[PDB]
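Entry:
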Amino acid sequence: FFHHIFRGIVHVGKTIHRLVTG
């Protein structure tokens, strides 16, 4: 579950930076 999650957390973690950056 290394890259399978780094990709699962990164994307989701990104939905916030963008949903938060504005």
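DSSP finds one helix and no strands in the chain.
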